[PDB]
Write an enzyme that holds these catalytic residues in place. Structure first.
Site, mmCIF file in Angstrom:
data_model
loop_
_atom_site.group_PDB
_atom_site.id
_atom_site.type_symbol
_atom_site.label_atom_id
_atom_site.label_comp_id
_atom_site.label_asym_id
_atom_site.label_seq_id
_atom_site.Cartn_x
_atom_site.Cartn_y
_atom_site.Cartn_z
ATOM 1 N N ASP A 48 -2.477 -5.174 0.923
ATOM 2 C CA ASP A 48 -1.339 -3.845 1.709
ATOM 3 C C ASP A 48 -0.172 -4.338 2.046
ATOM 4 O O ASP A 48 0.665 -3.506 1.943
ATOM 5 C CB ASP A 48 -2.514 -3.280 2.756
ATOM 6 C CG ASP A 48 -3.835 -2.831 2.492
ATOM 7 O OD1 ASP A 48 -3.655 -2.047 1.644
ATOM 8 O OD2 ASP A 48 -4.517 -3.454 2.936
ATOM 9 N N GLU A 74 0.907 -1.165 -0.041
ATOM 10 C CA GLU A 74 -0.009 -0.116 0.102
ATOM 11 C C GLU A 74 0.785 1.323 -0.046
ATOM 12 O O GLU A 74 2.059 1.150 0.495
ATOM 13 C CB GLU A 74 -0.978 0.171 1.190
ATOM 14 C CG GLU A 74 -1.827 1.197 1.406
ATOM 15 C CD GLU A 74 -2.763 1.502 0.249
ATOM 16 O OE1 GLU A 74 -3.761 0.751 -0.047
ATOM 17 O OE2 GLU A 74 -2.406 2.224 -0.513
ATOM 18 N N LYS A 94 -15.370 -7.694 2.377
ATOM 19 C CA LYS A 94 -14.036 -7.883 1.927
ATOM 20 C C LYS A 94 -13.468 -9.339 1.625
ATOM 21 O O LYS A 94 -12.675 -9.701 0.720
ATOM 22 C CB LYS A 94 -13.171 -7.204 2.970
ATOM 23 C CG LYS A 94 -13.019 -5.525 2.770
ATOM 24 C CD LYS A 94 -11.494 -5.262 2.577
ATOM 25 C CE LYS A 94 -11.411 -3.733 2.969
ATOM 26 N NZ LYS A 94 -12.006 -2.524 2.532
HETATM 27 O O1 GY9 Z 1 -6.081 -0.591 -1.755
HETATM 28 C C1 GY9 Z 1 -7.288 -0.305 -1.666
HETATM 29 N N1 GY9 Z 1 -7.844 0.054 -2.765
HETATM 30 C C2 GY9 Z 1 -7.180 0.487 -3.993
HETATM 31 C C3 GY9 Z 1 -7.027 2.156 -4.242
HETATM 32 O O2 GY9 Z 1 -8.457 2.206 -4.435
HETATM 33 C C4 GY9 Z 1 -8.723 3.852 -4.206
HETATM 34 C C5 GY9 Z 1 -10.165 4.179 -4.553
HETATM 35 C C6 GY9 Z 1 -10.433 5.546 -4.419
HETATM 36 C C7 GY9 Z 1 -9.392 6.520 -4.081
HETATM 37 C C8 GY9 Z 1 -8.196 5.919 -3.959
HETATM 38 C C9 GY9 Z 1 -7.790 4.579 -4.014
HETATM 39 C C10 GY9 Z 1 -8.376 -0.552 -0.586
HETATM 40 N N2 GY9 Z 1 -9.643 -0.293 -1.005
HETATM 41 C C11 GY9 Z 1 -10.243 -0.315 0.181
HETATM 42 C C12 GY9 Z 1 -11.867 0.085 -0.256
HETATM 43 C C13 GY9 Z 1 -12.826 -1.198 -0.365
HETATM 44 C C14 GY9 Z 1 -12.410 -1.148 -1.768
HETATM 45 C C15 GY9 Z 1 -12.523 0.287 -2.484
HETATM 46 N N3 GY9 Z 1 -11.827 0.804 -1.494
HETATM 47 C C16 GY9 Z 1 -11.446 2.107 -1.543
HETATM 48 O O3 GY9 Z 1 -12.010 2.922 -2.382
HETATM 49 C C17 GY9 Z 1 -10.620 2.919 -0.616
HETATM 50 O O4 GY9 Z 1 -10.874 3.665 0.418
HETATM 51 C C18 GY9 Z 1 -10.989 3.155 1.778
HETATM 52 C C19 GY9 Z 1 -12.286 2.914 2.459
HETATM 53 C C20 GY9 Z 1 -12.237 2.507 3.887
HETATM 54 C C21 GY9 Z 1 -11.220 2.606 4.537
HETATM 55 C C22 GY9 Z 1 -9.903 2.652 3.884
HETATM 56 C C23 GY9 Z 1 -9.807 3.103 2.425
HETATM 57 CL CL1 GY9 Z 1 -8.550 3.215 1.751
HETATM 58 N N4 GY9 Z 1 -9.877 -0.670 1.321
HETATM 59 C C24 GY9 Z 1 -8.636 -1.061 1.488
HETATM 60 O O5 GY9 Z 1 -8.534 -1.383 2.824
HETATM 61 C C25 GY9 Z 1 -7.962 -0.867 0.613
HETATM 62 O O6 GY9 Z 1 -6.602 -1.213 0.747
HETATM 63 MN MN MN Z 2 -6.702 -2.194 3.116
HETATM 64 MN MN MN Z 3 -4.778 -1.358 -0.163
#
Ligand code: GY9
Ligand code: MN
Ligand code: MN
Length: 179
Positions: A92, A64, A118
Site C-alpha cells: 500500500d 494503493e 497476511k
Molecule cells: O491491495 C489489495 N488488493 C489488491 C486489489 O484487490 C481487489 C480485490 C477485489 C476488488 C478490488 C480489489 C489488498 N487486498 C486486501 C484483501 C486481502 C487480499 C484480497 N483482498 C481484497 O480482495 C481487498 O478487499 C479488502 C478486504 C478487507 C479490507 C480491505 C480490503 Cl481492500 N487487503 C489489503 O489490505 C489490500 O491492500
Molecule cells: Mn492493504
Molecule cells: Mn493494497
C-alpha cells in the site's frame, strides 16, 4: 439498490468512492452488488491516505489507489532506486524514511489472525505490516508502528465512527459477517 451502497456514498469522500469503484470494476466486481466489499475498500483507502498524511512531507510514496499497471511501475522505480527486493504482491505504501514497503490492513475479525494470514500470504517478510481494527486495536511488525501515537489514534477514532454509523443503520452485522 441497497442501503449499504447509499450509506458509503454519503459517508466517504467522492474521490475515495471513485477510486474504490474503479478498483472493484478493474478486478471485475460491482459496488452495487458487493456492497460490503465496496465499504471495506473505501475504508482501507481512507486509512491508507490518513496513514501517509501522518508522516513528514516526502516520507511516503502511495501505492494503493492506483491502477495495477502504474502501481507496479512506481514499485519498480522504488526497488530499482533503493535496492529493496521487489515484493510479490502490491503493497500500500513505501516508507522513504525506513526504506520498506508497508502493507496496511483493516480487519473486522480479530487482530492476531488477520496478521498471520497476511503474513503467510506475503511470506517474504521484507515489507512492513500494519493492521488496524474497527474496535481500536493495532499491531505492527516488530511492534514498530512507524507513525507516532496521535496519527494512529486518529485512524482508530475514524474506524470506530464508521462502525457506529453502520450500527445505527443496522448494517454492522452484515458487514461483520462478510469477511
Ligand atoms: O491491495 C489489495 N488488493 C489488491 C486489489 O484487490 C481487489 C480485490 C477485489 C476488488 C478490488 C480489489 C489488498 N487486498 C486486501 C484483501 C486481502 C487480499 C484480497 N483482498 C481484497 O480482495 C481487498 O478487499 C479488502 C478486504 C478487507 C479490507 C480491505 C480490503 Cl481492500 N487487503 C489489503 O489490505 C489490500 O491492500
Ligand atoms: Mn492493504
Ligand atoms: Mn493494497
Amino acid at each position: 439498490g441497497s442501503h449499504m451502497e447509499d450509506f458509503v456514498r454519503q459517508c466517504f469522500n467522492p474521490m475515495i468512492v471513485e477510486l474504490a469503484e474503479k478498483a472493484m470494476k478493474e478486478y471485475g466486481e460491482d459496488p452495487k452488488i458487493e456492497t460490503n466489499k465496496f465499504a471495506a475498500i473505501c475504508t482501507h483507502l481512507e486509512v491508507c491516505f490518513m496513514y501517509s498524511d501522518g508522516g513528514s512531507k516526502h516520507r511516503f510514496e502511495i501505492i494503493e489507489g492506483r491502477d495495477r499497471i502504474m502501481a507496479w511501475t512506481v514499485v519498480n522505480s522504488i526497488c530499482n532506486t533503493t535496492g529493496v527486493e521487489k515484493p510479490k504482491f502490491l503493497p500500500d505504501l513505501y516508507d522513504y524514511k525506513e526504506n520498506r514497503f508497508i502493507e496496511i490492513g483493516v480487519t473486522r475479525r480479530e487482530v492476531h489472525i488477520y496478521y498471520l494470514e497476511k503474513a503467510n500470504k506475503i511470506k517474504s517478510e521484507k515489507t512492513h505490516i500494519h493492521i488496524f481494527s474497527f474496535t481500536g486495536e493495532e499491531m505492527a511488525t516488530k511492534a514498530d508502528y512507524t507513525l507516532d501515537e496521535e496519527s494512529r489514534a486518529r485512524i482508530k477514532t475514524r474506524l470506530f465512527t464508521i462502525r457506529q454509523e453502520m450500527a445505527s443503520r443496522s448494517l454492522w452485522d452484515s458487514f461483520r459477517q462478510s469477511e
